Design a protein around this nucleic acid. Structure first.
Length: 134
RNA sequence: UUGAGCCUUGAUGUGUAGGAUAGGUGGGAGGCUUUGAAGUGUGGACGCCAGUCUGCAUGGAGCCGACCUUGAAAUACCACC
């Protein structure tokens, strides 16, 4: 299945560990080893029911460092995806992007949402491995 | 032993347009390749038997992304599932 590069992408990052917000921003430099400039996509598994139309989260947040206001909306399962800019942006720069997104999701808390909201926040680059933040 | 929760990993998913036994969504267009390649001998899993996956290796270093038909993009690539 996997090959020379794709194995090392999962060997560098410990899958069975949820890193801190100060750790995932700098570790993603090892994953991006492409010719071009990649971008970081954020996967947030919202604790909402996608089969209920009254709990849909829809909105847009302003990225302090651009890519650059982005738009987002969850799928028919519960996980919402949006980018927070390029990978060549500094680690502290992506720190500002990620925290502004997390507050934005909490600024659109559904009224009928019963349960813990996020329970897992994960980010990944274009050639990135599974990296979750606290 | 035999069931279930669950970690890692790996496969699975053809109304119909159709080169795809392509679920939604999604970031980006290079990955791939001599940390030993396309095609094939032959064997296994799966199988709605349509066509994917895949052990060894002669061989021996090439394959392929937006492009095109689609409501959707190409497990070339990854992430959440």
């Amino acid at each position: 299945k996997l090959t020379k590069r794709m194995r090392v992408i999962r060997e560098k990052v410990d899958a069975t560990k949820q890193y801190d917000i100060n750790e995932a921003i700098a570790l993603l430099k090892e994953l991006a080893t492409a010719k071009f400039v990649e971008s970081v996509d954020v996967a947030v598994n919202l604790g909402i029911d996608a089969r209920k139309s009254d709990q849909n989260v829809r909105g847009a947040t302003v990225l302090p460092h651009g890519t650059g206001q982005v738009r987002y909306r969850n799928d028919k399962n519960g996980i919402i995806h949006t980018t927070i800019g390029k990978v060549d942006f500094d680690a502290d720069k992506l720190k500002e992007n990620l925290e502004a997104l997390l507050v934005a999701l909490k600024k659109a808390k559904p009224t009928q949402a019963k349960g813990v909201y996020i329970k897992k926040v994960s980010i990944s680059t274009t050639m990135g491995a599974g990296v979750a933040v606290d």
